Amino acid sequence: TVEMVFIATVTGSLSLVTVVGNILVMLSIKVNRQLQTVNNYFLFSLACADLIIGAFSMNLYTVYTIKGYWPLGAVVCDLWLALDYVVSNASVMNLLIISFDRYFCVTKPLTYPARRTTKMAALMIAAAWVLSFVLWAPAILFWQFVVGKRTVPDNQCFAQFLSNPAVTFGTAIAAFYLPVVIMTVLYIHIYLASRSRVHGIDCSFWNESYLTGSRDERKKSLLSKFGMDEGVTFMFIGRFDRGQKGVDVLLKAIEILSSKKEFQEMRFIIIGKGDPELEGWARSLEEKHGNVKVITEMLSREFVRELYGSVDFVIIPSYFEPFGLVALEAMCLGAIPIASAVGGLRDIITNETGILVKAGDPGELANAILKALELSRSDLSKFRENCKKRAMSFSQMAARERKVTRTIFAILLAFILTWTPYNVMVLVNTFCQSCIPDTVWSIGYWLCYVNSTIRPACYALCNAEFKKTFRHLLLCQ
């Protein structure tokens, strides 16, 4: 009986992993202020239920397997059945709410995320747990009372309703099959809507690491490359059109400034091609003024990254701009945006992270360039740091939302792969009894328990913030 010690330790350590893993999930949500969102309220109840499974359900099932029979009597049996049947079904319901939540998040992105509340989450979690208890506890505990006899043998522990095969499959449909089909079709739709998505900036590319030396050094190097003196550098990048990028505003704005006493302190780099009439205008001002430089071509992002991390300001005179990645790209390299108050730009830029102007007004853009000239002092370094922080936090917002949706899919996938063997065994049992050996049935039962152990692992793998704080919690010892 040396094998008895082996199975008890393998499963005993598996019970320990589930208890450790879910306590760390629970503790991190409550301790870490960054993990206190509406989604993690539902992930907390999953860890609550999985802690119960790992601590109670697993240890009791270790007894059943090691002994070969149920030795703790009818009282402990009914309390083990009700506990297991409520907690497991609450987790199924929580997973169902979490999926519809992700579905609406993606299908109604301008209506539903505002309607999302922390109080609504708690009301939904309670509703799931209460509904599960009202649905399983009476069926588990009172079936023997209603019938008037306990049909369960003294050596076994199972729900009395399971004896009726019509109730067994009728419950597998309502508690597994139907909830899985719903969560499958909800996710097909999520994928379809996510396929047409517009991703933000590639933060692995747009960053200061690539640049060498000091900004003052790079700016002096860049200005001498275009054969120009040291001054306040203003840069434009984009298609030379009459419709949305608006080089004609900046071109008209330089003309207003060329009559001023501040013009000699300014430096202009105009990059892009398109309209030949607008290209010739840019080329005209380049000839008239030594502080104006024009590059009539669309340059690759690798050099634009160097330019953003060298120039003082970036002028975005967009007539129409829905997303404004150009602002975020420039802000990440320390460039201060002087942009039109349109679409995405209106959202990205604040009073502390750049100058906003009225679109299609060369007079207001000229005044803004003049305001930027007065800002030229030690105050630029602290302004640049605000532009970095804002663009990085803003880009982190779009990355974390898809990350949450990716985690819930991984938890649904984990759930499907672990409970399908047992549910398909139940399906085989309907027509073929003694088709499945007792050893194969036990593998099916244990896989349902393993789902509780692999859910914390899903949070560490699909979320970087969870993986880091897990190590921080074990640090305390």
Short mmCIF file of C-alpha atoms in Angstrom, two decimals, residues 32-426:
data_model
loop_
_atom_site.label_atom_id
_atom_site.label_comp_id
_atom_site.label_asym_id
_atom_site.label_seq_id
_atom_site.Cartn_x
_atom_site.Cartn_y
_atom_site.Cartn_z
CA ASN A 32 -3.09 46.21 -5.28
CA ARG A 33 -5.03 49.45 -6.08
CA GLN A 34 -4.48 48.81 -9.85
CA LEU A 35 -6.43 45.49 -9.64
CA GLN A 36 -9.64 47.04 -8.17
CA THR A 37 -11.67 47.27 -11.44
CA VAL A 38 -15.27 46.00 -12.18
CA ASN A 39 -13.88 42.83 -13.89
CA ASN A 40 -11.68 41.77 -10.90
CA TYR A 41 -14.86 41.83 -8.67
CA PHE A 42 -16.04 38.76 -10.69
CA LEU A 43 -12.50 37.26 -10.68
CA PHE A 44 -12.54 37.58 -6.85
CA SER A 45 -15.71 35.38 -6.51
CA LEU A 46 -14.14 32.78 -8.89
CA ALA A 47 -11.09 32.67 -6.54
CA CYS A 48 -13.51 32.55 -3.53
CA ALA A 49 -15.28 29.48 -5.01
CA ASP A 50 -11.93 27.93 -6.14
CA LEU A 51 -10.49 28.35 -2.59
CA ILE A 52 -13.50 26.34 -1.26
CA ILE A 53 -12.87 23.67 -3.98
CA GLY A 54 -9.12 23.49 -3.23
CA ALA A 55 -9.51 23.41 0.59
CA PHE A 56 -12.66 21.30 1.09
CA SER A 57 -13.90 19.50 -2.10
CA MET A 58 -10.38 18.22 -3.10
CA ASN A 59 -9.37 16.90 0.35
CA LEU A 60 -12.73 15.09 0.74
CA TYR A 61 -12.41 13.56 -2.76
CA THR A 62 -8.81 12.47 -1.85
CA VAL A 63 -10.44 10.44 1.01
CA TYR A 64 -13.05 8.83 -1.39
CA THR A 65 -10.29 7.71 -3.86
CA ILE A 66 -7.74 6.50 -1.21
CA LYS A 67 -10.47 4.59 0.76
CA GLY A 68 -12.28 3.33 -2.37
CA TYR A 69 -15.67 4.22 -0.78
CA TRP A 70 -17.40 7.11 1.14
CA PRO A 71 -16.60 6.66 4.89
CA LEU A 72 -17.85 9.96 6.46
CA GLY A 73 -21.63 9.20 6.47
CA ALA A 74 -24.82 10.81 5.01
CA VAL A 75 -24.63 14.15 6.96
CA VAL A 76 -21.11 15.07 5.70
CA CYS A 77 -22.14 13.74 2.23
CA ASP A 78 -25.15 16.10 1.82
CA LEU A 79 -23.06 19.07 3.10
CA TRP A 80 -20.26 18.14 0.65
CA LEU A 81 -22.74 17.72 -2.26
CA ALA A 82 -24.60 21.02 -1.60
CA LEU A 83 -21.31 22.99 -1.10
CA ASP A 84 -19.75 21.60 -4.34
CA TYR A 85 -23.01 21.96 -6.37
CA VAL A 86 -23.54 25.63 -5.34
CA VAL A 87 -19.92 26.94 -5.59
CA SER A 88 -19.30 25.20 -9.01
CA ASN A 89 -22.59 26.51 -10.46
CA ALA A 90 -21.95 30.05 -9.11
CA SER A 91 -18.62 29.98 -11.06
CA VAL A 92 -20.50 28.95 -14.27
CA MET A 93 -23.00 31.84 -13.78
CA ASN A 94 -20.16 34.33 -12.99
CA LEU A 95 -18.38 33.23 -16.22
CA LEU A 96 -21.66 33.82 -18.12
CA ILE A 97 -22.09 37.44 -16.74
CA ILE A 98 -18.35 38.18 -17.39
CA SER A 99 -18.74 37.09 -21.10
CA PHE A 100 -21.90 39.20 -21.76
CA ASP A 101 -20.02 42.07 -20.03
CA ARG A 102 -17.10 41.61 -22.52
CA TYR A 103 -19.59 41.21 -25.41
CA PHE A 104 -21.40 44.54 -24.65
CA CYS A 105 -18.02 46.27 -23.94
CA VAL A 106 -16.97 45.50 -27.58
CA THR A 107 -20.44 45.75 -29.32
CA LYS A 108 -21.54 49.02 -27.58
CA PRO A 109 -18.15 50.83 -26.97
CA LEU A 110 -19.66 54.36 -26.80
CA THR A 111 -22.68 53.47 -24.55
CA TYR A 112 -21.99 50.41 -22.32
CA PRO A 113 -18.50 51.19 -20.68
CA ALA A 114 -19.99 54.37 -19.10
CA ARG A 115 -22.99 52.32 -17.75
CA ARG A 116 -20.49 49.85 -16.11
CA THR A 117 -20.49 50.32 -12.28
CA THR A 118 -18.73 48.73 -9.24
CA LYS A 119 -22.15 48.54 -7.40
CA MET A 120 -23.71 46.69 -10.42
CA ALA A 121 -20.89 44.05 -10.34
CA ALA A 122 -21.57 43.26 -6.60
CA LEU A 123 -25.35 43.01 -7.35
CA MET A 124 -24.59 40.58 -10.22
CA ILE A 125 -22.12 38.44 -8.16
CA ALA A 126 -24.63 38.18 -5.26
CA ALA A 127 -27.45 37.35 -7.77
CA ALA A 128 -25.33 34.47 -9.23
CA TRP A 129 -24.41 33.00 -5.76
CA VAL A 130 -28.00 33.39 -4.41
CA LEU A 131 -29.64 31.98 -7.60
CA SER A 132 -27.22 28.95 -7.50
CA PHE A 133 -28.02 28.31 -3.76
CA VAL A 134 -31.82 28.65 -4.33
CA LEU A 135 -31.48 26.23 -7.34
CA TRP A 136 -29.13 23.52 -5.97
CA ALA A 137 -29.26 23.44 -2.10
CA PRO A 138 -33.05 22.52 -1.91
CA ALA A 139 -32.67 19.95 -4.76
CA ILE A 140 -29.60 18.37 -3.02
CA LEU A 141 -30.85 18.44 0.63
CA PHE A 142 -34.68 18.05 0.31
CA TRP A 143 -34.96 15.45 -2.53
CA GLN A 144 -34.82 12.63 0.09
CA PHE A 145 -37.42 14.50 2.25
CA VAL A 146 -39.95 14.91 -0.64
CA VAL A 147 -39.49 11.26 -1.82
CA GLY A 148 -39.54 10.06 1.83
CA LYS A 149 -36.45 7.80 1.57
CA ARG A 150 -32.68 8.04 1.03
CA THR A 151 -31.77 5.92 -2.06
CA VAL A 152 -28.01 6.74 -1.74
CA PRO A 153 -26.01 3.67 -0.49
CA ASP A 154 -24.09 4.12 2.84
CA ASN A 155 -20.76 3.49 0.97
CA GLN A 156 -21.36 6.15 -1.78
CA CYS A 157 -21.76 9.93 -1.98
CA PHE A 158 -23.86 11.33 -4.85
CA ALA A 159 -26.86 13.65 -5.43
CA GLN A 160 -30.22 11.74 -5.22
CA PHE A 161 -31.57 13.61 -8.34
CA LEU A 162 -28.68 12.10 -10.49
CA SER A 163 -30.41 8.66 -10.18
CA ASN A 164 -33.10 10.00 -12.60
CA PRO A 165 -31.21 10.09 -15.99
CA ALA A 166 -33.68 12.69 -17.45
CA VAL A 167 -32.83 15.11 -14.58
CA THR A 168 -29.03 14.34 -14.97
CA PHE A 169 -28.88 15.41 -18.66
CA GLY A 170 -31.54 18.12 -18.11
CA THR A 171 -29.13 19.72 -15.57
CA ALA A 172 -25.98 19.20 -17.74
CA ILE A 173 -27.79 21.18 -20.49
CA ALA A 174 -28.75 24.08 -18.13
CA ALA A 175 -25.44 24.08 -16.14
CA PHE A 176 -22.86 23.23 -18.87
CA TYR A 177 -23.94 22.67 -22.54
CA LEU A 178 -26.33 25.69 -22.93
CA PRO A 179 -23.92 28.02 -20.91
CA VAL A 180 -20.96 26.84 -23.10
CA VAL A 181 -22.86 27.36 -26.43
CA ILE A 182 -23.86 30.92 -25.25
CA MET A 183 -20.24 31.74 -24.24
CA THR A 184 -19.01 30.28 -27.61
CA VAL A 185 -21.30 32.41 -29.88
CA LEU A 186 -20.65 35.51 -27.63
CA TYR A 187 -16.90 35.03 -28.26
CA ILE A 188 -17.24 34.42 -32.05
CA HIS A 189 -18.96 37.88 -32.14
CA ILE A 190 -16.24 39.45 -29.92
CA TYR A 191 -13.55 38.16 -32.38
CA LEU A 192 -15.51 39.51 -35.40
CA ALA A 193 -15.81 43.03 -33.88
CA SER A 194 -12.16 42.90 -32.65
CA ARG A 195 -11.03 41.93 -36.22
CA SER A 196 -12.02 45.44 -37.53
CA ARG A 197 -10.29 47.23 -34.55
CA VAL A 198 -7.77 50.13 -34.92
CA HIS A 199 -4.75 49.44 -32.64
CA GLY A 200 -2.89 52.22 -30.82
CA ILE A 201 0.86 52.85 -30.80
CA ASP A 202 3.57 50.14 -30.73
CA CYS A 203 5.25 51.25 -27.44
CA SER A 204 8.10 48.74 -28.15
CA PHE A 205 9.00 51.04 -31.12
CA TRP A 206 7.94 54.59 -30.03
CA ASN A 207 10.30 55.18 -27.02
CA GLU A 208 13.41 57.18 -25.86
CA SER A 209 15.77 54.09 -25.64
CA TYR A 210 16.56 54.26 -29.42
CA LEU A 211 17.85 57.89 -29.17
CA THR A 212 21.52 58.70 -28.30
CA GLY A 213 22.82 61.51 -26.07
CA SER A 214 20.97 64.68 -25.00
CA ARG A 215 17.97 66.33 -26.73
CA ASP A 216 20.02 69.62 -26.97
CA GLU A 217 22.78 67.55 -28.69
CA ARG A 218 20.38 65.80 -31.14
CA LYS A 219 18.57 69.12 -31.96
CA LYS A 220 21.91 70.90 -32.71
CA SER A 221 22.97 67.88 -34.89
CA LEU A 222 19.62 67.83 -36.77
CA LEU A 223 19.56 71.61 -37.41
CA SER A 224 23.16 71.59 -38.77
CA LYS A 225 22.22 68.57 -41.02
CA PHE A 226 19.53 70.79 -42.68
CA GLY A 227 22.08 73.69 -42.67
CA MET A 228 20.37 75.82 -39.98
CA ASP A 229 21.27 77.80 -36.81
CA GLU A 230 20.28 76.80 -33.23
CA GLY A 231 16.72 77.90 -32.34
CA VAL A 232 13.20 76.80 -31.28
CA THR A 233 12.35 73.98 -33.74
CA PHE A 234 8.79 73.41 -35.00
CA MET A 235 8.13 70.28 -37.09
CA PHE A 236 5.28 69.18 -39.40
CA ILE A 237 4.89 65.63 -40.73
CA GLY A 238 2.12 64.36 -43.03
CA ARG A 239 0.47 64.35 -46.49
CA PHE A 240 0.32 67.73 -48.26
CA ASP A 241 -3.48 67.88 -48.81
CA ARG A 242 -6.33 70.46 -48.80
CA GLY A 243 -8.65 68.09 -46.92
CA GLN A 244 -7.51 66.77 -43.52
CA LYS A 245 -3.74 66.96 -42.66
CA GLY A 246 -3.79 70.74 -43.36
CA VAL A 247 -0.29 71.93 -44.38
CA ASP A 248 -2.01 75.06 -45.90
CA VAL A 249 -2.90 76.31 -42.35
CA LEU A 250 0.77 76.00 -41.17
CA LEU A 251 2.00 77.50 -44.53
CA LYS A 252 -0.35 80.53 -44.04
CA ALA A 253 0.67 80.67 -40.32
CA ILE A 254 4.45 80.87 -41.22
CA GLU A 255 3.51 83.78 -43.58
CA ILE A 256 1.81 85.71 -40.70
CA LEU A 257 4.87 84.99 -38.46
CA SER A 258 7.40 86.05 -41.20
CA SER A 259 6.23 89.70 -40.69
CA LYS A 260 6.88 89.48 -36.86
CA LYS A 261 10.04 90.27 -34.77
CA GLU A 262 9.91 86.73 -33.26
CA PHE A 263 10.38 84.88 -36.61
CA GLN A 264 14.24 84.87 -36.36
CA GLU A 265 13.98 82.88 -33.06
CA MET A 266 11.83 80.17 -34.80
CA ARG A 267 12.88 77.14 -36.92
CA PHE A 268 10.58 75.14 -39.24
CA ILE A 269 10.85 71.63 -40.73
CA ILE A 270 7.99 70.76 -43.15
CA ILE A 271 7.93 67.08 -44.20
CA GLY A 272 5.46 65.47 -46.63
CA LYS A 273 4.27 65.39 -50.26
CA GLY A 274 1.01 65.52 -52.26
CA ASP A 275 -0.46 68.76 -53.70
CA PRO A 276 2.18 70.34 -56.07
CA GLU A 277 0.72 73.87 -55.51
CA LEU A 278 1.19 73.38 -51.70
CA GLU A 279 4.69 71.82 -52.25
CA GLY A 280 5.71 74.87 -54.33
CA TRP A 281 4.40 77.21 -51.55
CA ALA A 282 6.54 75.33 -48.99
CA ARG A 283 9.50 75.48 -51.46
CA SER A 284 8.87 79.28 -51.89
CA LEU A 285 9.08 80.00 -48.10
CA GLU A 286 12.25 77.79 -47.92
CA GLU A 287 13.91 80.17 -50.49
CA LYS A 288 12.59 83.36 -48.81
CA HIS A 289 13.48 82.28 -45.25
CA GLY A 290 16.68 80.60 -43.97
CA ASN A 291 14.82 79.34 -40.84
CA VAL A 292 12.35 77.30 -43.00
CA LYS A 293 13.27 73.77 -44.31
CA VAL A 294 11.09 71.58 -46.58
CA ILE A 295 11.48 67.81 -47.31
CA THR A 296 8.97 66.97 -50.10
CA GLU A 297 8.67 63.18 -49.41
CA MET A 298 7.01 60.72 -46.98
CA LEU A 299 9.82 59.52 -44.67
CA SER A 300 9.95 56.16 -42.76
CA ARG A 301 8.90 56.05 -39.04
CA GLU A 302 12.47 55.09 -37.87
CA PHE A 303 13.78 58.59 -38.83
CA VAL A 304 10.49 60.28 -37.70
CA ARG A 305 11.18 58.64 -34.25
CA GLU A 306 14.64 60.40 -34.26
CA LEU A 307 13.01 63.72 -35.32
CA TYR A 308 10.34 63.56 -32.53
CA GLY A 309 13.11 62.94 -29.96
CA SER A 310 15.12 66.00 -31.24
CA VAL A 311 12.67 68.85 -32.21
CA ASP A 312 11.04 71.08 -29.54
CA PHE A 313 7.44 71.10 -30.87
CA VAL A 314 5.23 69.15 -33.33
CA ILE A 315 2.50 71.09 -35.18
CA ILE A 316 -0.57 68.96 -36.04
CA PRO A 317 -2.88 71.36 -38.01
CA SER A 318 -5.43 68.58 -38.76
CA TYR A 319 -8.86 69.59 -40.16
CA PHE A 320 -10.07 66.04 -39.34
CA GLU A 321 -8.23 63.59 -37.01
CA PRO A 322 -10.24 60.72 -35.42
CA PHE A 323 -7.48 58.87 -33.47
CA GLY A 324 -4.31 61.01 -33.56
CA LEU A 325 -1.49 58.43 -33.20
CA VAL A 326 0.93 61.15 -34.51
CA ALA A 327 0.34 63.11 -31.22
CA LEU A 328 1.01 60.02 -29.02
CA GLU A 329 4.07 59.03 -31.12
CA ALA A 330 5.56 62.56 -30.76
CA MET A 331 4.60 62.82 -27.03
CA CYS A 332 6.41 59.51 -26.22
CA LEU A 333 9.68 60.95 -27.57
CA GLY A 334 9.29 64.19 -25.58
CA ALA A 335 7.93 66.37 -28.42
CA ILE A 336 5.27 68.90 -27.33
CA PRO A 337 2.17 68.96 -29.60
CA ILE A 338 0.67 72.22 -30.97
CA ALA A 339 -2.47 70.64 -32.47
CA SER A 340 -6.01 71.47 -33.65
CA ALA A 341 -8.85 70.84 -31.12
CA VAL A 342 -10.31 67.96 -33.24
CA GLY A 343 -11.42 64.36 -32.53
CA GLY A 344 -8.68 62.27 -30.89
CA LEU A 345 -6.31 65.26 -30.39
CA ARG A 346 -9.07 67.00 -28.31
CA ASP A 347 -8.93 63.91 -26.00
CA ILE A 348 -5.12 63.18 -25.86
CA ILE A 349 -3.95 66.81 -25.20
CA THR A 350 -4.74 68.73 -21.93
CA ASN A 351 -3.49 72.14 -20.55
CA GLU A 352 -0.37 70.42 -19.07
CA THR A 353 0.44 68.25 -22.16
CA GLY A 354 0.43 70.76 -25.08
CA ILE A 355 -1.25 73.68 -26.89
CA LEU A 356 -4.67 73.26 -28.60
CA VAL A 357 -5.98 75.58 -31.39
CA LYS A 358 -9.09 76.03 -33.60
CA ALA A 359 -8.78 74.01 -36.85
CA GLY A 360 -8.57 76.03 -40.08
CA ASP A 361 -7.38 79.25 -38.40
CA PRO A 362 -3.80 80.31 -39.37
CA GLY A 363 -4.14 83.31 -37.02
CA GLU A 364 -4.66 81.17 -33.90
CA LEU A 365 -1.87 78.72 -34.96
CA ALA A 366 0.54 81.69 -35.36
CA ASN A 367 -0.33 82.92 -31.81
CA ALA A 368 0.18 79.34 -30.48
CA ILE A 369 3.69 79.19 -32.10
CA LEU A 370 4.30 82.59 -30.36
CA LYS A 371 3.10 81.14 -26.98
CA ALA A 372 5.48 78.15 -27.53
CA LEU A 373 8.37 80.64 -28.09
CA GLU A 374 7.68 82.33 -24.68
CA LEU A 375 7.60 78.83 -23.06
CA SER A 376 11.22 78.32 -24.31
CA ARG A 377 13.14 78.16 -20.97
CA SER A 378 13.97 75.48 -18.28
CA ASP A 379 10.15 74.84 -18.06
CA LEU A 380 10.33 72.72 -21.28
CA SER A 381 11.97 69.69 -19.52
CA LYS A 382 9.08 69.36 -16.98
CA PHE A 383 6.54 69.92 -19.84
CA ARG A 384 8.19 67.08 -21.91
CA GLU A 385 7.93 64.70 -18.89
CA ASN A 386 4.13 65.38 -18.73
CA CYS A 387 3.86 64.58 -22.49
CA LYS A 388 5.65 61.22 -21.90
CA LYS A 389 3.45 60.22 -18.88
CA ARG A 390 0.13 61.24 -20.59
CA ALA A 391 0.82 59.42 -23.91
CA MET A 392 2.07 56.27 -22.09
CA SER A 393 -0.96 56.14 -19.69
CA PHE A 394 -3.40 56.83 -22.61
CA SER A 395 -1.84 54.01 -24.75
CA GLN A 396 -1.97 51.66 -21.67
CA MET A 397 -5.82 52.15 -21.57
CA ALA A 398 -6.47 50.44 -24.97
CA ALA A 399 -3.92 47.65 -24.19
CA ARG A 400 -5.50 46.68 -20.80
CA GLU A 401 -9.10 46.38 -22.17
CA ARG A 402 -8.18 43.78 -24.87
CA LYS A 403 -5.99 42.06 -22.19
CA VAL A 404 -9.09 41.57 -19.94
CA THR A 405 -11.11 40.09 -22.89
CA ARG A 406 -8.10 37.80 -23.68
CA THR A 407 -7.98 36.57 -20.01
CA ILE A 408 -11.76 35.72 -19.87
CA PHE A 409 -11.42 33.72 -23.15
CA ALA A 410 -8.44 31.78 -21.62
CA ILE A 411 -10.57 31.07 -18.47
CA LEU A 412 -13.54 29.93 -20.69
CA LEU A 413 -11.11 27.74 -22.73
CA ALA A 414 -9.68 26.26 -19.47
CA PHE A 415 -13.29 25.61 -18.28
CA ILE A 416 -14.31 23.86 -21.58
CA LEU A 417 -11.18 21.60 -21.72
CA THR A 418 -11.58 20.50 -18.02
CA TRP A 419 -15.35 19.83 -17.81
CA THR A 420 -15.98 18.33 -21.32
CA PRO A 421 -14.50 14.86 -20.35
CA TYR A 422 -16.92 14.52 -17.37
CA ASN A 423 -19.94 15.93 -19.30
CA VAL A 424 -19.18 13.66 -22.32
CA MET A 425 -18.87 10.66 -19.85
CA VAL A 426 -22.37 11.61 -18.48
#
